Design a protein around this ligand. Structure first.
Ligand SMILES: [NH3+][C@H]1CCc2cccc(-c3ccccc3)c2CC1(O)O
Ligand code: NA
Ligand code: NA
Ligand SMILES: [Zn+2]
Length: 891
């Protein structure tokens, strides 16, 4: 083979597009798109043919400077590229015009212009604008847009495109139109249009410094207008945060957010017209689970922060994607951490990175955050680009500190405003701030660029020495990145290591927290006036995206878990104790399986560790959010990073043993806490207020729901009574948990029907119910999936429905990885079926295959057979074919 684009090959276009004037005329069975491109010849032109991207368009006519061009003689069109022969391309400013027909009403791939229920909506990132009209569809082609939309007024009373609405007009035959002018130069991936019978809430915002009045609108279909308020509040918070932290003010008189039901991704930052998966915009406390609130906060914030990091400064080319995505995720993380004031925001992000992203980075799909090549750029909207990218963007803040970070960021945003940029431009701006901080104009960040170009997760390991006579402590540090298919030689990175030192006798800090800068393969950091042997607190806040090998004893880790100040180090110390136990018991079960032993031993869980868990849980003044992290074992996708040829049944046995060891000691504690937390966790303050969320209270419910799961799996005496009462709670997080945990009881199908009836009248709540069933720990899960298919999912093409039914189930370690391969077969069937109408979502459904080469060799073969069968399917999409060829080491 397919067509591969390479980062090194970037060259500017020989053409310029200065203005785009669109007329989009929507009818029931066709949409007519007329477009005039005011174009010119660039200084790079060498007399080449004029080639436009245009995919699946039906040409009515195309013209240059008022004369229609003729197919064969002056142009060719192959359904992908329109080529105008150079002998017919003007040598100076010219107008290119075209009229094409498209069909949003049958566009089930949700790229370009499409119909979502009764809403017409676009999605153009990355390369979708070419599915609407002809363009040089790449992000360095920046232009100004004048867009007119017309439609039946009864069906489509609300018409939106980017920018100021400059005219509204009636049209004979029951139609109407609206015209928009977007004064900000933009690439075409930021174009959007919406038409629908939309309802809204609105507010007026006044910017902090320029005192500009901004009208804020949030839109949904009529049925769900009551679910729009939290999004509007989140938008106001986002605007204030960008003003307060970054000095950045919104730059149009109006900002619209729109929820649609059918959306391939979370949302999209189209200028002045952000469009969202409804599941990331709409919520209400009676019809959404708790996690919806942080999700909406994240996604609204993310899309708002793109207004500068992506829109006002955009991308030279798609290889720079992390420049807007890593940076915008980092901005949203700062925002969400400040808004929630919990440990959950940061720890949740780290947990996702160290599971999903670390898995990706050790898989055949491993790439640097700035990739070197692609076929379908939609396959590179990855956790690597977004989440490792965000950690790389966060490390600049750790290295520079807040003052100089803000200085460097403002250099970047000012210098590149209204223009494209590259990752090097960001590093240059940060380097200017670095020279200031170090008071050294010879200092540079050249080594830092390796975070953009080098793939793989570094491993950072430690050795310690304490001289009690000298009161001198040394931390010897080593870094190593495993060679991979991107680099045979790996180089040392600039790794910032935020550290403290804890006195094990009293739990107190012994030094001012300090950031060590490891730039060599190894280094020794010495500390004087250390009065007693400390326990080091390493990588506070998770200060670099690495595998941490602390070389601490479990006794030392327990002391950090109890007494350290840093939430991440406490949680990581607990994680490391669990991992040591998991690897040991896994090996014991594995040997017993392989050697067909009739009897054998298992290493018990450390009793002092269990005591420490009890100590933390029983502390009435300790944080409920943190507590939920310590009672759960690490995620399977984290564990797999530390085991080769992983047998998933052996791992399931391992985790069950460990959980039962701890529960045998702590179940009475868990039950007492589950009961004692009820009053505050389930208090109804703010239940009618969609402008305020108590994130601490939410973490109390999370803790209760985590404990209830543990007690239910343990068959704690009479816990079904608590489950049934829990099913009567007003909070969906609780009553959906009651379904999950009832899987271990004969009441499961009673609660299945009860909660279905509570969910079925709200589209998003029903999707949450589907996820709850899909992830239920049921021995009959395969028959339950068939029931969902036949009774609820049916023929839906809504990505939220399909993903809800199948993805949670793929994380069922015992069932999805059944040694028959039946789970691999089931999901591959869904992938192949979905690829015939939505290649992006089909490729998303491939997620469970990413770890194929980490499993035992029998499961490797079963997964490879299904992947190779998918690759043989006629008319497989480029998206899915690229993904599977790369994943199977063919590309
Ligand atoms: N520019 C777009 C591209 C699409 C895309 C793809 C994958 C993930 C995400 C996303 C990340 C965090 C929160 C919400 C959505 C997005 C949204 C986006 O805005 O980055
Ligand atoms: Na439907
Ligand atoms: Na639907
Ligand atoms: Zn983004």
């Amino acid at each position: 083979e397919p067509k591969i684009h390479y980062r090194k090959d970037y060259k500017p276009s020989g053409f310029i597009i200065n203005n785009v004037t669109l007329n989009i005329n929507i009818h029931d069975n066709e949409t007519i798109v007329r477009s005039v491109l005011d174009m010119d010849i660039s200084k790079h032109n060498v007399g080449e043919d004029l080639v436009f991207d245009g995919v699946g368009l039906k040409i009515n006519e195309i013209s240059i400077n008022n004369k229609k061009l003729v197919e064969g003689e002056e142009y060719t069109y192959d359904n992908e590229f329109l080529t105008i022969f150079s002998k017919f391309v003007p040598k100076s400013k010219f107008a290119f015009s075209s009229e094409v027909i498209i069909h949003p009403e049958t566009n089930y791939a949700l790229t370009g212009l499409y119909k979502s229920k009764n809403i017409i909506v676009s999605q153009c990132e990355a390369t979708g604008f070419r599915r609407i009209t002809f363009f040089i569809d790449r992000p360095d082609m920046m232009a100004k847009y004048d867009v007119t939309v017309t439609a039946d007024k009864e069906k489509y009373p609300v018409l939106l495109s980017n920018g100021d609405k400059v005219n509204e007009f009636e049209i004979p035959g029951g139609r109407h139109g609206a015209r928009f002018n977007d004064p900000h130069l933009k690439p075409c991936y930021l174009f959007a249009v919406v038409a629908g019978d939309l309802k809204h809430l609105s507010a007026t915002y006044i910017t902090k410094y320029t005192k500009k009045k901004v009208e804020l609108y949030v839109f949904s279909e009529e049925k769900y207008v009551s679910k729009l308020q939290w999004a509007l509040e989140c938008l106001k918070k986002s605007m204030a945060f960008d003003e307060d932290y970054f000095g950045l003010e919104y730059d149009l008189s109006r900002l619209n957010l729109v929820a649609v039901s059918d959306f391939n991704v979370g949302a999209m930052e189209n200028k002045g017209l952000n469009i969202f998966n409804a599941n990331s915009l709409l919520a209400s406390k009676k019809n959404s689970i708790d996690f919806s609130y942080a999700r909406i906060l994240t996604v609204v914030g993310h899309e708002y922060f793109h207004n500068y990091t992506g829109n006002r400064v955009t991308l030279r080319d798609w290889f720079q994607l992390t420049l807007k995505e890593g940076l915008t995720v980092h901005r949203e993380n700062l925002f969400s951490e400040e808004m929630t004031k919990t440990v959950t925001t940061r720890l949740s992000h780290v947990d996702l990175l160290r599971s999903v992203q670390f898995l990706e980075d050790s898989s055949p799909l491993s790439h640097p955050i700035r990739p070197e090549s692609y076929v379908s750029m939609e396959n590179f909207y990855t956790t690597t680009v977004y989440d490792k990218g965000s950690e790389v963007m966060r490390m600049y803040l750790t290295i520079l500190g807040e003052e100089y970070y803000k200085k460097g960021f403002d250099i970047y945003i000012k210098k590149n405003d209204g223009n494209t940029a590259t990752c090097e431009d960001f590093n240059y701006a940060m380097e200017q701030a670095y020279k200031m901080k170090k008071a050294d104009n010879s200092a540079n960040l050249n080594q830092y660029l390796l975070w953009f170009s080098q793939s793989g997760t570094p491993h950072v390991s430690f050795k310690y020495n304490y001289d009690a006579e000298k009161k001198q402590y040394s931390i010897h540090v080593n870094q190593y990145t495993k060679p991979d298919e991107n680099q045979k030689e790996k180089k040392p990175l600039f790794i910032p290591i935020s550290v403290g030192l804890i006195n094990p006798e009293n739990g107190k800090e012994m030094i001012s927290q300090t950031t060590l800068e490891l730039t060599k393969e190894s280094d020794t950091f010495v500390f004087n006036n250390i009065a007693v042997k400390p326990i080091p607190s390493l990588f506070r806040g998770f200060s670099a995206p690495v595998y941490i090998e602390d070389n601490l004893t479990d006794e030392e880790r327990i002391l950090l878990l109890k007494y350290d100040s840093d939430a991440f180090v406490r949680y990581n110390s607990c994680t490391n104790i669990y991992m040591k136990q998991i690897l040991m018991n896994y090996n014991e079960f594995l040997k017993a399986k392989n050697e067909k032993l009739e009897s054998f031993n298992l290493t018990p869980v450390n009793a002092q560790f269990i005591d420490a868990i009890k100590y933390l849980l029983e502390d009435p003044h300790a944080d409920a959010g943190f507590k939920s992290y310590i009672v759960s074992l690490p995620q399977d996708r984290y564990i797999i990073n530390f085991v080769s040829n992983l047998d998933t049944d052996v791992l399931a046995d391992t985790k069950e043993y460990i959980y039962k060891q701890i529960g045998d000691k702590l179940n009475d504690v868990y039950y007492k806490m589950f009961k004692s937390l009820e009053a505050k966790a389930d208090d109804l303050t703010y239940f009618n207020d969609e402008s305020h969320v108590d994130f601490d209270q939410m973490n109390m419910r999370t803790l209760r729901n985590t404990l209830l799961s543990l007690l239910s799996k343990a068959q704690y005496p009479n816990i079904l009574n608590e489950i049934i009462e829990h099913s009567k709670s007003p909070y969906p997080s609780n009553w959906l948990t009651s379904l999950s945990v009832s899987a271990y009881f004969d009441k499961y199908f009673e609660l299945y029907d009860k909660t279905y009836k509570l969910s079925k009248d709200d589209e998003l709540l029903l999707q949450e119910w589907l996820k709850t069933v899909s992830r239920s720990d049921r021995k009959d899960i395969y028959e339950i999936l068939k029931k969902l298919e036949n009774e609820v999912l049916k023929d839906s093409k809504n990505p939220n429905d399909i993903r809800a039914v199948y993805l949670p189930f793929t994380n069922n370690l015992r069932r999805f990885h059944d040694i028959s391969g039946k789970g691999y077969k089931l999901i591959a069937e869904v992938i192949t079926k979905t690829d015939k109408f939505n290649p992006m979502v089909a490729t998303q459904l491939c997620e469970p295959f990413k770890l194929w080469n980490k499993l035992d060799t029998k499961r490797q073969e079963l997964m490879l057979n299904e992947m190779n069968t998918m690759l043989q399917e006629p008319n497989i999409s480029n998206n899915l074919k690229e993904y599977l060829l790369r994943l199977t080491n063919k590309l």
